[PDB]
Amino acid sequence: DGQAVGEKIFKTAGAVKSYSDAEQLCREAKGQLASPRSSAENEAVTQMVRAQEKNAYLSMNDISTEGRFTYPTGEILVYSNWADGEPNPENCVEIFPDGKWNDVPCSKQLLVICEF
Ligand SMILES: [Ca+2]
Predict the structure, then answer these.
(1) What separation in Å is there between the alpha carbon of 41 and the centre of ligand 1?
(2) Are 43 and 99 in contact (CB under 8 A)?
(3) CA of 88 to the centre of ligand 1 (A)
């Protein structure tokens, strides 16, 4: 089970992993890391973070061009929800239980939320 918005479904098993391990878990499940593209999608992911009491990874990263955060397609963000002062190396993105985002080191261990 999980939270859905439109045709997108977000799911978690409560796993806590580094970015690379998180990406592999979602891909092996035939999904990808949570990639909220709208307010409504962001709120669905946020509800799951609040339930699990653990910040989660989003998919987006700036490893290709610093400051330019992209999806696994390589396309630029169509939506963002950065915390005050963010983005403030921190190439990956976490989402807080208040729904705001913070760039983080990709070695950080965070909740794994996948989208389908
Ligand atoms: Ca940061």
Answers:
(1) 22
(2) yes
(3) 5
Rounded alpha-carbon distances, angstroms, from residue 49 to 44, 65, 73, 75: 9, 28, 24, 25
How far is the centre of ligand 1, averaged over its atoms, from the C-alpha of 71 (Å)? 18
30, two tokens: 């035939």
Which domains, from first to last, does the chain contain?
1-116 (3.10.100.10)
The secondary structure of residue 8, as a DSSP letter, is E
Q: What tokens were used for 48?
A: 């799951």
CA of 106 to the centre of ligand 1 (A): 11
* Cβ contact 2:9 at 8 Å: yes
Resolution in A: 1.0
Give the number of other CB atoms < 10 A from CB of residue 61: 21
